[PDB]
Amino acid sequence: DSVGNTVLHALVEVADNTADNTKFVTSMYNEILILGAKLHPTLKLEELINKKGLTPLALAASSGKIGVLAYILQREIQEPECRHLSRKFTEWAYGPVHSSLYDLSCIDTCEKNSVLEVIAYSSSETPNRHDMLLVEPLNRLLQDKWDRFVKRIFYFNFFVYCLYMIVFTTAAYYRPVDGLPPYKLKNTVGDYFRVTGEILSVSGGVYFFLRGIQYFLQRRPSMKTLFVDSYSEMLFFVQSLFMLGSVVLYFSHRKEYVASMVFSLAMGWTNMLYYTRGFQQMGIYAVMIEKMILRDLCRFMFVYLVFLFGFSTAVVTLIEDGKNPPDSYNSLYSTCLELFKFTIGMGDLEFTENYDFKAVFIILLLAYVILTYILLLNMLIALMGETVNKIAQESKNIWKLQRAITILDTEKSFLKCMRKAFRSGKLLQVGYTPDGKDDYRWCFRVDEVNWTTWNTNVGIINEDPGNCEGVKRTLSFSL
Amino acid sequence: MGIYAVMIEKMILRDLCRFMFVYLVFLFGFSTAVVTLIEDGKNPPDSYNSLYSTCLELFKFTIGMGDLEFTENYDFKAVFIILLLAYVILTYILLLNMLIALMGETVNKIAQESKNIWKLQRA
Ligand SMILES: CCCCCCCC/C=C/CCCCCCCC(=O)O[C@@H](COC(=O)CCCCCCCCCCCCCCC)COP(=O)([O-])OCC[N+](C)(C)C
Ligand SMILES: CCCCCCCC/C=C/CCCCCCCC(=O)O[C@@H](COC(=O)CCCCCCCCCCCCCCC)COP(=O)([O-])OCC[N+](C)(C)C
Ligand SMILES: CCCCCCCC/C=C/CCCCCCCC(=O)O[C@@H](COC(=O)CCCCCCCCCCCCCCC)COP(=O)([O-])OCC[N+](C)(C)C
Ligand SMILES: CCCCCCCC/C=C/CCCCCCCC(=O)O[C@@H](COC(=O)CCCCCCCCCCCCCCC)COP(=O)([O-])OCC[N+](C)(C)C
Ligand SMILES: CCCCCCCC/C=C/CCCCCCCC(=O)O[C@@H](COC(=O)CCCCCCCCCCCCCCC)COP(=O)([O-])OCC[N+](C)(C)C
Ligand SMILES: CCCCCCCC/C=C\CCCCCCCC(=O)O[C@@H](COC(=O)CCCCCCCCCCCCCCC)COP(=O)([O-])OCC[N+](C)(C)C
Ligand SMILES: CCCCCCCC/C=C\CCCCCCCC(=O)O[C@@H](COC(=O)CCCCCCCCCCCCCCC)COP(=O)([O-])OCC[N+](C)(C)C
Ligand SMILES: C=C(C)[C@]12C[C@@H](C)[C@@]34O[C@](Cc5ccccc5)(O[C@@H]1[C@@H]3C=C(COC(=O)Cc1ccc(O)c(OC)c1)C[C@]1(O)C(=O)C(C)=C[C@@H]41)O2
Ligand code: NA
């Protein structure tokens, strides 16, 4: 059509994930490929693209379609003359044990739109991105890319970053207090280590600034409501604005460089919770922070700032001048601070006596403590009790995705890893295509068992079991 | 009585060893920021320039004995209060109310398991 969709595209567009719709979509999706080969065996139906350039496999991954995705990856057409359209190939079976070759042609970072890329980089307006990492050839592919060449690099990124915050702490702790900020450099062994510690701290601050600025502009354009999806990357960019903010103030002869550097230190150590994802039980703790600093704390700090600025306007209107730790509490800033201390647990009734009408002054403080210390802070605990029960299940789904983006970004950063990114490549011969040729398609492997049924298998690639680097193919193959 | 002491050995290795890593990031995060601010004597009296004292003065906000304006030897009062108010909201309001919710989930899990562990610890 005008959009570029063909028949196999439109069956994906008209899916809506319900188990009745998954039945007759994949049934009708099956019948067209076979009938495509009977009329046109020279045609390859699923290579075709629309004007966005997506294949019907990747279109099911770009949207949230899970049943159409689980079908195409686990696709075997058992009947002969149209078996080359399969994707899941069982290789041998020895009673219970059932070994299968999944296929990795369009997926696994080989092409322009691989479904491992398109799932992870999707803008979260498409649902069920977390669900689409549960299918079988993907969920054992990311787990088996982590166990070699990515666990070694991710532990090295976390070690260099911890050597960055020890240098940037110590170079800021021992800063000169003497005078105006472009400081001369004495010939000591102390000042050589310090000005080295500053140059290694600015150059780290440029690195987080450039990887920020390619994430927003050169790749991945992002709208304003998407900054709760890209939360973990926004914090590494705000840090690099303060650290480069100090270098402007440092050479502008301004003493306010210690007001921007310090917010980079406090945000520097705090962003070390970015690396505690990729660990399972640690990672569910830091997911709940980014889900409850935008949901439960931003709602609570609106209601709390109504009550605090409600009653601390009432109290300053009461208390008069000196009238006769001493301080004039007539400022609105002091009395908004003295009523914050009731929440913190350091709460001083009778903090002043410069008022008049003692009866209404105590009633205001006692109506404040019951509203704020007794009621809201015991409602916040109950509402976090409901939120943690909800995102107990969701956070396992978000953690697997936050493991997957690490694996993709490491592959894009190295060309020699891309020739090592062929996880279980093996370039295996699988079957026989039309025009009488070998298959030669990159294939993965898996193992299962079955005991409820008797495990009857119609087609088996290798008649003789096991994988000992020597096989003989079965005569079950037609050609 | 025995179901009470099983929950201690299951939550001094699971819930407290995870919490005391995140808490020691925030406490050593902000108490590095504060010592970099506060300058020398410049003119309960004490020199708060040590990292040990200021890591202790920010522990006291968790314990419920929390003194804002614990020093005045700094400069830039506006950034000193913002650091303390971003600390108290992060630590006293957010994490300690997340710890109560996460112990609420753990006790519901090991309510059933602890009857099973008690019979073994009797055996
Ligand atoms: C007194 C105390 C003693 C301590 C002495 C300290 C002196 C040494 C200090 C050194 C730190 C100074 C460098 C600053 C740059 C920042 C580095 C960084 O953290 O970024 C990355 C490093 O991963 C990389 O790819 C960059 C590698 C850095 C160059 C290596 C040279 C130093 C090696 C050192 C070891 C030599 C071993 C030799 C070989 C075995 C990791 O971060 P990221 O996760 O990629 O960024 C977030 C990504 N995100 C934005 C998408 C979320
Ligand atoms: C593994 C975990 C632990 C690791 C431990 C790591 C090392 C541990 C320790 C390390 C150093 C121990 C200190 C010895 C020297 C003390 C100096 C002194 O007494 O004079 C004075 C400094 O006045 C100066 O300007 C002199 C500068 C010399 C200090 C050396 C800088 C540190 C190295 C650069 C970084 C390395 C870069 C590496 C590059 C490759 C004393 O300073 P102050 O009175 O405290 O001023 C505070 C100012 N404030 C309160 C206003 C904020
Ligand atoms: C110069 C100073 C540099 C220091 C930093 C250099 C560090 C370099 C790297 C260090 C990495 C440490 C080695 C990890 C190797 C095994 C991984 C693993 O078992 O995965 C499991 C962890 O699952 C969890 O949730 C347990 C958490 C343990 C990891 C420790 C957290 C970070 C502490 C670090 C402190 C940083 C200090 C902060 C900054 C000073 C996940 O598998 P599972 O499904 O859960 O299976 C359960 C099996 N189990 C029973 C074993 C749990
Ligand atoms: C002088 C005047 C001061 C006040 C004017 C400033 C207000 C100007 C405008 C502000 C607009 C919001 C800015 C706050 C950032 C929060 C992020 C966000 O909104 O995205 C969240 C959208 O989900 C929601 O918005 C609903 C849940 C939070 C309610 C937001 C109310 C905050 C307004 C008062 C804030 C004051 C706090 C501090 C006060 C200083 C996404 O996070 P989530 O967890 O995925 O959402 C739940 C799931 N859900 C999408 C299915 C629903
Ligand atoms: C300067 C650098 C400082 C940091 C470097 C030190 C880190 C070096 C390495 C440390 C490795 C661990 C040592 C802590 C002892 C805990 C016991 C344990 O791990 O066994 C537990 C394994 O289960 C788990 O590990 C997952 C749940 C806890 C996560 C552990 C993170 C602690 C790392 C930060 C600790 C810092 C705390 C204090 C900070 C001073 C068994 O208990 P469980 O309840 O049966 O497990 C849950 C059930 N499960 C098995 C099914 C999952
Ligand atoms: C959890 C965090 C809390 C912790 C503490 C936070 C504390 C921060 C809270 C507040 C900031 C404190 C500073 C304010 C200034 C008061 C000081 C003073 O002396 O008064 C002065 C100003 O006079 C007034 O300010 C009158 C008050 C008008 C209130 C208008 C409401 C604003 C709506 C807001 C919506 C919020 C609603 C909430 C909904 C989200 C009078 O003196 P002056 O003579 O005019 O001086 C001028 C000198 N000159 C003439 C030479 C130029
Ligand atoms: C809940 C429990 C908390 C309760 C309180 C706990 C408090 C404990 C917290 C901390 C211990 C307190 C003691 C430290 C020493 C500071 C004192 C001082 O005066 O500075 C001195 C050292 O200078 C420095 O120490 C600079 C700071 C280096 C920071 C390096 C980061 C370490 C990473 C850690 C990873 C952790 C991250 C967390 C992740 C798990 C400067 O003075 P000097 O001149 O050098 O003196 C030498 C004299 N001489 C020259 C003759 C020999
Ligand atoms: C960019 C945002 C939205 C943000 C920037 C700063 C100012 C922040 O305050 C907030 C607002 C705020 C202020 C006070 C209390 C709660 C929230 O939340 C984060 C932001 C949030 C936190 C708390 O969250 C974290 O940093 C932990 C964290 C968890 C997961 C992550 O992936 C992560 O990034 C790696 C960081 C700590 C601060 O960054 C911090 O160090 C300081 C001084 C203030 C915190 O604004
Ligand atoms: Na108290």
TrEMBL record, chain A:
The gene is TRPV1. Coiled coil: none annotated. GO terms for cellular component: dendritic spine membrane; GABA-ergic synapse; postsynaptic membrane. It is a multi-pass membrane protein. Belongs to the transient receptor (TC 1.A.4) family. TrpV subfamily. TRPV1 sub-subfamily. The lineage of its organism: Eukaryota, Metazoa, Chordata, Craniata, Vertebrata. It catalyses: Mg(2+)(in) = Mg(2+)(out); K(+)(in) = K(+)(out); Na(+)(in) = Na(+)(out); Ca(2+)(in) = Ca(2+)(out). Residues 155-395 form the Ion transport domain. It comes from the Eukaryota. Its main location: membrane. It is found in: Cell projection, Dendritic spine membrane. Keywords: ANK repeat, ATP-binding, Calcium, Calcium channel, Calcium transport, Calmodulin-binding, Cell membrane, Cell projection, Glycoprotein, Ion channel, Ion transport, Membrane, Metal-binding, Nucleotide-binding, Phosphoprotein, Postsynaptic cell membrane, Receptor, Repeat, Sodium, Synapse, Transmembrane, Transmembrane helix, Transport. The keyword Transport applies. One of its GO terms (molecular function) is calmodulin binding. The chain crosses the membrane at residues 153-172, 192-210, 231-251, 257-276, 297-319, 359-383. GO terms for biological process: behavioral response to pain; calcium ion import across plasma membrane; cellular response to acidic pH; cellular response to heat; detection of chemical stimulus involved in sensory perception of pain; detection of temperature stimulus involved in sensory perception of pain; detection of temperature stimulus involved in thermoception; diet induced thermogenesis. This is Transient receptor potential cation channel subfamily V member 1. The chain holds residues 283 to 779 of 840 of the full protein.
